[PDB]
Write a protein that binds this ligand. Structure first.
Ligand SMILES: O=C(O)CCC(=O)NCCCCCCOC(=O)c1[nH]c2cc(Cl)ccc2c1-c1c(-c2ccc(F)cc2)ncn1Cc1ccc(Cl)cc1
Ligand SMILES: O=C(O)CCC(=O)NCCCCCCOC(=O)c1[nH]c2cc(Cl)ccc2c1-c1c(-c2ccc(F)cc2)ncn1Cc1ccc(Cl)cc1
Lengths: 95, 94
């Protein structure tokens, strides 16, 4: 829908901060598709209860490792392109 | 398109180094669309002749401000998503 599936399969190498965050949620590899990165980020957000209890599509990442990476205090999980961009800033795409 | 049309219109604010570079090929503003940033980078690459004479789609940015911004010694200009990624690290989205 919002992101083409070919792009979701884009092979990527998270920078150290992002990678540590993925590892804290059980990620084992140093390379991932963007889909895998997103799944693991969903896991982190949910386990740390970063979503707002009342408005569960709003993630409050301020004062969390995630907000340091994304550089915003909050975001909507409905804006896929913005999220992809914030993630792209924290990785290298692989050849 | 490997880059959707609307991603090209994304409003962005270059960080100081990338903005120095854009200004060096005539950039007047402090915020831009991604399309405009690419254009100015294209002119930078062409004016400094960072493309390979033999393989004109390959850019050798090693040992140049560009390569320091991009974090690679070379890249192909057909790798659009890589390129947008390398640029995005050097700016803030508005
Ligand atoms: O009842 C309703 O009204 C809504 C119920 C509903 O529609 N959906 C339930 C949600 C499915 C969630 C499981 C799969 O989601 C993900 O893996 C996922 N990963 C993310 C990473 C980031 Cl940085 C942000 C959000 C999500 C997220 C998720 C979430 C989510 C929300 C809160 C939370 F704590 C964790 C995940 N909701 C939808 N999604 C899907 C999605 C996938 C990719 C992108 Cl770019 C954006 C969204
Ligand atoms: O058949 C052939 O022989 C090749 C002929 C051909 O198709 N030539 C077309 C060249 C058009 C150049 C005009 C527009 O290009 C750009 O503005 C542009 N900007 C860029 C910035 C970077 Cl970081 C890298 C490449 C370019 C680039 C360019 C270049 C280019 C190549 C070498 C060079 F010295 C300068 C620009 N070629 C095509 N493009 C288009 C383009 C636009 C966006 C993206 Cl993500 C990637 C590519």
């Amino acid at each position: 829908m919002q992101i083409p599936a070919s792009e979701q399969e884009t092979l990527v190498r998270p920078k150290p901060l992002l990678l540590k965050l993925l590892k804290s949620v059980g990620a084992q590899k140093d390379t991932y598709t963007m889909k895998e990165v997103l799944f693991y980020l969903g896991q982190y957000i949910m386990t740390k209860r970063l979503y707002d209890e009342k408005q569960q599509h709003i993630v409050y990442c301020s004062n969390d490792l995630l907000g340091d990476l994304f550089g915003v205090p909050s975001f909507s999980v409905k804006e896929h392109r913005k999220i992809y961009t914030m993630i792209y800033r924290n990785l290298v795409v692989v050849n």
